[PDB]
Amino acid sequence: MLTKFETKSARVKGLSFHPKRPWILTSLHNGVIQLWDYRMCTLIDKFDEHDGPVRGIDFHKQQPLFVSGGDDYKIKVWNYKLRRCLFTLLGHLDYIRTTFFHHEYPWILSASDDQTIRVWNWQSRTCVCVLTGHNHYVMCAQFHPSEDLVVSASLDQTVRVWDISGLRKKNLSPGAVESDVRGITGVDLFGTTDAVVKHVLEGHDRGVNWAAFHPTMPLIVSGADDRQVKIWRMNESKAWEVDTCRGHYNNVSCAVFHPRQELILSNSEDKSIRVWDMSKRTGVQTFRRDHDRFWVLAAHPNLNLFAAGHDGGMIVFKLERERPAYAVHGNMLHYVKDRFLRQLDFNSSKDVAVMQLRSGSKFPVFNMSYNPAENAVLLCTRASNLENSTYDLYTIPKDADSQNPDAPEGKRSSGLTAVWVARNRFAVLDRMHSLLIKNLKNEITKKIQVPNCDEIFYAGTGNLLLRDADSITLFDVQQKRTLASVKISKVKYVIWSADMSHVALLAKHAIVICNRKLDALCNIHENIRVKSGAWDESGVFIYTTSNHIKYAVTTGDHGIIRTLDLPIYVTRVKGNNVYCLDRECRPRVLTIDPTEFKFKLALINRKYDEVLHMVRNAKLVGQSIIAYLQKKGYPEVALHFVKDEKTRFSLALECGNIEIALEAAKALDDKNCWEKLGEVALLQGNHQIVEMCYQRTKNFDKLSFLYLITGNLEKLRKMMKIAEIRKDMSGHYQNALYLGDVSERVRILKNCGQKSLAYLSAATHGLDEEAESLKETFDPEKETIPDIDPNAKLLQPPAPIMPLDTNWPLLTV
Amino acid sequence: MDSEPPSEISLKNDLEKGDVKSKTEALKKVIIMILNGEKLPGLLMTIIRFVLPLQDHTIKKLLLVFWEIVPKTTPDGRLLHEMILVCDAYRKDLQHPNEFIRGSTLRFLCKLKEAELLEPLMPAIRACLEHRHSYVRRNAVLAIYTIYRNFEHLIPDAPELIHDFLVNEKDASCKRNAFMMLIHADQDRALDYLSTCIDQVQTFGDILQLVIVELIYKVCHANPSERARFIRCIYNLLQSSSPAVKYEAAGTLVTLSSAPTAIKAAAQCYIDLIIKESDNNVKLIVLDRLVELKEHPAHERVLQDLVMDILRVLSTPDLEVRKKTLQLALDLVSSRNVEELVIVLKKEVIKTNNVSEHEDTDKYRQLLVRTLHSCSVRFPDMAANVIPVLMEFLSDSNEAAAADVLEFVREAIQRFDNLRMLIVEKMLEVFHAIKSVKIYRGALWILGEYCSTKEDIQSVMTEVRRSLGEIPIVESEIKKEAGELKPEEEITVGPVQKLVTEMGTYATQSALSSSRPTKKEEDRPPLRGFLLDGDFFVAASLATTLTKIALRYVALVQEKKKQNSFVAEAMLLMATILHLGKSDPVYAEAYVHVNQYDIVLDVLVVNQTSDTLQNCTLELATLGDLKLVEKPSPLTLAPHDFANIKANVKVASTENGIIFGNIVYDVSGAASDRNCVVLSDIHIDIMDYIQPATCTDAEFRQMWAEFEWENKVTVNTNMTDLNDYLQHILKSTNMKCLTPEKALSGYCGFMAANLYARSIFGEDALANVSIEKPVHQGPDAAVTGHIRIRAKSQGMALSLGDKINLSQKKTSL
Amino acid sequence: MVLLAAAVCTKAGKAIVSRQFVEMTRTRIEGLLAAFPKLMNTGKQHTFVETESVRYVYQPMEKLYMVLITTKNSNILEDLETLRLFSRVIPEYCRALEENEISEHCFDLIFAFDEIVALGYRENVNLAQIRTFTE
């Protein structure tokens, strides 16, 4: 037993399990009612609906509501989504012990401690029916999964089976016209206290406090004020079917059947919760949890967990399996047993499930294993780890125990374990708790064989006969020898391709998919360890790593195919579909699409024309179509998507033709881009394009520098003026030098107020007159000879080239 | 009603009731719920109906209140019009004989930048054109400016209405009370008028004139406002070497550190700075002005030095002030730090002079000897001062008191070769009363090195050699030491040769000499006897023996760089060390895209189903430290809809109460039980939530000490250095590689990174990545690195441990 | 605006009454006042303390903070002076600071806030001036 949930609330008189969802309601003696998401751990609601004890609690899930009944003497209906009181109704004139909801119309049943249980119709003004019989308290009313009948447990020493659509109960003799009820000695003795009798049941244990059913059985068990539990047939009122379970020490508050085990779980107002044998009907074992007394019990009609309410609070407790072994063939999931019986196949986003016949497991699973050709299933039965049990083989597409006993298919024989192994019809078995090999002599092997033995490892489960004592050991087909042992880190699972020759093992990042023995074919790219993923024999690997099913790869493409609304494990890939089942084991299926897959299959084979159609909004994203296609240094993909002003910018430098850059740079509304593309421009060779860019980034001085280098003199002058005003002394200043005469500087420098510098520059060119002007306007003294000349010839022949390097030739490829 | 968001039904009732008090209270209750930010439009017709025309100020004032904080939003009782229920009968309010209602009305009306009230606010200046108070005229200049701000930057607001429309600002200057709402964008004539007003000021008003127009030619002209600007203006006209002597800055400055010692400590700093600007060597840092309080005339009465003595501190004022003060003595006067540190140290270090400077705790005493002594090592002049003071330290003549003294002085002799010959005779004296290691160690070293100088040695050593105390470390120090210097230059009943005999016995041999040594078995395991035993080639003589070693100093020994030094005065250093200096089916497909630096989670939402999913809404959630920067906003997910919807993503937020998993993404649709479904887009980790932070070597070291990091793993793909994979990955688990903890050479040179983070997890995170990259013939495991990790309870330690391996995700839809 | 809000706080973790001169700091007002004034505005018993890049000026009165907040500033004397005048006006309305009595005279205090500081510019008020309005 595992404790899923345990919240101390104080004395819970009523407890009920939601049939739709894995929720619990508790009604407390403190007058508070609480609705719990016991799996999620999130309080849904909490209401103080009455000062004193609220003894009865129910789900009213026909429309999303819960119903409570309290000692206010009322049955009240409550919203769990809007937290408001939907409707209020007069159940009775005393304590509402248990309440039950009709699924016919919004009718509500309340069982009370004033000896009647009544059903009331809100939708109309009518109280449709009152069901009477008790002479002392109806402690409990309980639904079967059909809505026609209810059972009530009362402390007048009976259990009364009622009809809710009926006036009290509904029955009529076909052998007589007279009423079924007799107040006289007939073939049984009872009073006149009913309209008619469909079924008056024993409840004698000095009154039964509660009654409840197994979800798939008409049988009911009742706990009563004494110290016994008595199991009843409510479908016949037999007294040759009723066995008494003895173990408890004081008044048993309830007893209900465990849906998922072959035991009956009871709880009593002593201090113990006792567990009972349901093939022997006496106490297997007693547990004390020391929360003292238990006044309520509950068994899940959604066959999830199990719960019992105590005087400290309640516990929902777990007797279920986690991470089961499974394999998918074409449309059949085969898995190892979990709650809610056998399920699987169909759906794709819903948490509903539905049945198909593909049970790999139909008996206690010692082993469940697929054939490597996927044609048989081996199920090993009668448990044990001694040296013998039974093993039953089933056919894989549709599974029975035996298909026919008169046909080779579906046979059984002895063997502690038998598990299939490669050569694709073979199996290896343990029948002495050694490794023995199994043949039948042609077809998938069903018959027990004793030759060949080993002295290492110990029988268990597998798919290649896994055995453990310190590692997971693969065993051979026809040899006693260990084929190989694997040791690695796991996430509690073993993943098969679908063929059970091969195995996938989980590692520190993702999963690795491997062949028979331990040989690693490839590694799935993905940062974290996947929960499960399976390969369609190889190639197309589909996996779950969250709430979505995505392909690790198909033909070098990468895609997330679709998301489901639940966390899940891939069951495996056999066919185009991928099939999944989770811990609770609800299915999702998903067709492998030609969405993400076609697009990149096409882009890889350099098709852009194909790819435009392929572009859809089921796969567009942001960077797999509209900006992933700007990721070629010799643009190809890049040419195709260029819609973003940034992608356009990028495209241009990758070609080296910046004509497009300037425009993208423009449409990026930014200077930085113009200077950087201008530099790239100078690199392709041509300075016209550089000028334009550099002019608008305002790098007139860079231009001034560039310009004799380029051999322009006309353009070089334009730069000088528009750098004059900036007082860029390594911009405006340059150009005068660069033309044969220096006069440009002389004026700019005059405006700077740098009269000295202006004179020196001018004077040397033999423009002593201008040099003198500067001296005269400002401080004179021009006579001085610095570490540089102040009057020696400056003349330079400017640019001998007739065509300039703004006109640098180009062809462009 | 402090904050009660559902109470709007009661407020409507309370708002009209025939009792004026109730109405006022109601309207008041509305105000307080809106201000907090809660529900308010239901009420509007009720609110508006009583109050509208009236001159009765309180309700009017209340309604006037509610029109500046929500008028636009509320529309039941107002709707949209030019003369709304905010102002239609508030033209009456503006034109009442009572100044208060008019004034109030004017004030809110003009305050709004509302365009549905633009016309009614314009002649609203009428209400305050007549100025019954200073408040009325100020209210007017602020309201005209607020009108100007509200779309009337042209002729609707600029001239006069009858006295103000943007002209109160002019009028105020010459009127009895000033206030200029004219700070920006307003009449030039008023700006000019404010200047005139500087003279004819009104003090509150002067702060308003002054924010607009500052700098005076004068000293002042009066009032705090002018005065406050004035110190700014003064700092301009003399920037040079701080303010030096703080101006009118002094008044605010004290409050800036009201907690309480820190003000004095700061004040002391400024006063020291101010005294003089010295040489400004190592801890001689006094700036400000060279002469302004001088230093050191011999005719100055009662001198500068009296204030200088405060700064020399033992703690003479309290600890915060102490740390500042010791640095400050050093700073005004020394040679560097050395001079004034020796004086200061002489006072602090242990003596027989004062017993208020000696203590029997050995480390502090020792440290104080080392601090005094480091000054000599720094600077020569100090050697001469230190040795006689050291002998006074010894004179205490407790076992331990001698001991500490002997230990440093012996180091000083290693530096200071045959210069401290004189000390030896003093040093022997207290060596006889003995209960500790330290005394034996040190004494044996002085007496040993110094042998030529003295001749006493059999007698001194021998009382101790046959005396007891604690003797582990004694062995090591005596072993290298006892023979040294001059081969036969002693004799009392054991010459220098007896000493070499002794020296050898004490090291690890055996010999009758000095009435046998105390112990022979050496100190910590590596040291042993043997090196020295081999040694003494030439019997205790300066050559290439113990003497050589003794009269030489290991490596460089200079300054206060901590090479035979300790770095200032021992008490001040503790504080400096402390200073760390830390700086409903649904289908999803998804990829993350970045265009023009916009980071977005691309999602495509797919309805593969024929069924209805209308009611479709899309939301991205805030989980914890993950947040939506804008959810996907399309109403998509309809019958056979493919859509691309973009959800923008952030990584940095504050924890929300909903789940803390990967990324939650929510699509809504038709269904009433699961109207909202959670389905996933691709991976985001728990690691995001960590917040990056950094450490320095001191913070790293402190944290190393603070909490354990023994935990290590070796991570593959740490083959590479710190910079490459390891930094990038460490970054993603919000970590950063900072400072080293390595020790590289030709045999050493693992790369070491000191990591830090301060996780939003109630822990920090730290680690050291050691990269085992071979720098030896026997590497650990070759290339790979072992990361030694922690976090504050090592719950994030583990994150560091595995997120430094690999990490990559991609898709290509 | 220079003055974002003028606010009376309880260090219960909420802005008890507060004034938004023009629609900007609605809900924003409560979060700032609730976190920062609890720590004494993060002060040390200093009238100016600045936290999360907002200048907080304050005075403690009981479990309550009278708070002025700015994130810009025109002059030193001025910020204190509006707070100060506010502190003459607040006991006339509420008899010191105390959350329940502050709560009851939301209207009184709020009106004073609009009057005292208009569009973030610190006007002046006085207890007699306040009277004309609430008359």
Coordinates of C-alpha atoms in Angstrom, one line a residue, chain B residues 362-508:
Chain B
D362 CA 49.0 34.1 21.7
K363 CA 47.9 34.7 18.1
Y364 CA 46.9 38.4 18.5
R365 CA 50.3 39.1 20.4
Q366 CA 52.2 37.2 17.6
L367 CA 50.4 39.1 14.8
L368 CA 51.2 42.3 16.6
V369 CA 54.9 41.4 16.7
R370 CA 54.7 40.6 13.0
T371 CA 53.1 43.9 12.1
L372 CA 55.7 45.9 14.0
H373 CA 58.5 43.9 12.4
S374 CA 57.1 44.1 8.8
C375 CA 57.8 47.9 8.9
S376 CA 61.6 47.1 9.2
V377 CA 61.3 44.7 6.3
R378 CA 59.6 47.5 4.4
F379 CA 61.9 50.2 5.2
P380 CA 65.5 50.2 6.9
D381 CA 65.1 52.9 9.4
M382 CA 62.4 50.8 11.1
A383 CA 64.9 47.9 11.8
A384 CA 66.8 50.0 14.2
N385 CA 63.5 51.0 16.0
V386 CA 62.0 47.5 15.9
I387 CA 64.7 45.4 17.6
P388 CA 64.8 47.2 20.9
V389 CA 61.0 47.4 21.0
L390 CA 60.9 43.7 20.4
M391 CA 63.1 43.1 23.4
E392 CA 60.6 45.1 25.6
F393 CA 57.9 42.7 24.1
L394 CA 59.8 39.8 25.4
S395 CA 60.3 41.3 28.9
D396 CA 56.6 40.4 29.8
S397 CA 58.2 37.0 30.7
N398 CA 55.2 34.8 30.4
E399 CA 56.0 31.6 28.5
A400 CA 53.7 32.6 25.7
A401 CA 54.5 36.3 25.8
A402 CA 58.2 35.6 25.0
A403 CA 57.1 33.1 22.6
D404 CA 55.3 35.2 20.1
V405 CA 58.0 37.8 20.4
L406 CA 60.8 35.3 19.5
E407 CA 58.8 33.9 16.5
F408 CA 58.7 37.1 14.5
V409 CA 62.1 38.4 15.5
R410 CA 63.7 35.2 14.2
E411 CA 62.1 35.9 10.7
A412 CA 63.5 39.5 10.9
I413 CA 67.0 38.0 11.4
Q414 CA 66.5 35.9 8.2
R415 CA 66.0 39.3 6.4
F416 CA 68.4 41.2 8.6
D417 CA 71.6 39.3 8.6
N418 CA 74.0 39.9 11.5
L419 CA 72.5 43.2 12.2
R420 CA 70.3 41.9 15.1
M421 CA 73.4 40.3 16.9
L422 CA 72.5 42.5 19.9
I423 CA 69.0 41.0 20.5
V424 CA 70.2 37.3 21.3
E425 CA 71.2 37.9 24.9
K426 CA 67.8 39.5 25.7
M427 CA 65.9 36.7 23.8
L428 CA 67.4 33.8 25.8
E429 CA 66.1 35.1 29.1
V430 CA 62.5 34.1 28.9
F431 CA 63.0 30.6 27.5
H432 CA 63.2 28.9 30.8
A433 CA 59.8 29.4 32.1
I434 CA 58.0 27.5 29.4
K435 CA 54.6 25.7 28.8
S436 CA 54.3 26.2 25.0
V437 CA 55.9 25.3 21.7
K438 CA 56.3 28.8 20.4
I439 CA 58.9 30.0 23.0
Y440 CA 61.1 27.0 22.4
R441 CA 60.8 27.4 18.6
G442 CA 61.7 31.0 18.5
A443 CA 64.3 31.1 21.2
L444 CA 66.1 28.2 19.8
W445 CA 66.2 29.9 16.4
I446 CA 67.7 33.3 17.8
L447 CA 70.2 31.7 20.1
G448 CA 71.0 29.3 17.3
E449 CA 71.7 31.8 14.5
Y450 CA 73.3 34.3 16.8
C451 CA 75.9 31.9 18.3
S452 CA 79.1 34.0 17.3
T453 CA 77.7 36.9 19.3
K454 CA 77.1 35.1 22.5
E455 CA 78.7 32.1 24.3
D456 CA 75.9 31.3 26.9
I457 CA 74.2 28.7 24.9
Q458 CA 74.6 25.3 26.7
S459 CA 73.3 27.0 29.8
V460 CA 70.2 28.6 28.3
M461 CA 69.2 25.9 26.0
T462 CA 69.8 23.2 28.6
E463 CA 67.2 24.3 31.2
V464 CA 64.5 24.2 28.4
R465 CA 65.8 21.0 26.8
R466 CA 65.2 19.2 30.1
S467 CA 62.0 21.2 30.8
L468 CA 58.5 20.4 29.4
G469 CA 55.7 22.2 27.9
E470 CA 54.3 21.4 24.4
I471 CA 57.0 20.4 21.9
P472 CA 55.8 19.2 18.4
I473 CA 56.8 22.2 16.1
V474 CA 59.7 23.0 18.4
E475 CA 61.5 20.1 16.6
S476 CA 61.2 21.5 13.2
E477 CA 62.4 24.9 14.2
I478 CA 65.3 23.7 16.4
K479 CA 66.2 21.2 13.7
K480 CA 67.2 23.7 11.0
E481 CA 68.5 26.2 13.6
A482 CA 70.6 25.2 16.6
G483 CA 74.3 25.0 15.3
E484 CA 74.7 28.2 13.1
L485 CA 77.3 30.9 12.7
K486 CA 81.0 30.6 13.5
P487 CA 82.4 27.1 14.2
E488 CA 83.7 27.6 17.8
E489 CA 82.7 31.0 19.2
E490 CA 80.7 29.9 22.1
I491 CA 81.3 27.9 25.3
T492 CA 79.7 27.8 28.8
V493 CA 80.1 24.0 29.2
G494 CA 79.1 23.3 25.5
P495 CA 80.7 25.2 22.6
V496 CA 79.1 25.7 19.1
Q497 CA 80.0 22.0 18.3
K498 CA 78.0 20.6 21.3
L499 CA 75.2 22.7 19.7
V500 CA 75.6 21.0 16.3
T501 CA 75.5 17.7 18.3
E502 CA 72.4 18.9 20.1
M503 CA 70.9 20.3 16.9
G504 CA 71.3 16.9 15.3
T505 CA 69.8 15.1 18.4
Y506 CA 66.8 17.4 18.6
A507 CA 66.3 16.9 14.8
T508 CA 66.0 13.1 15.0

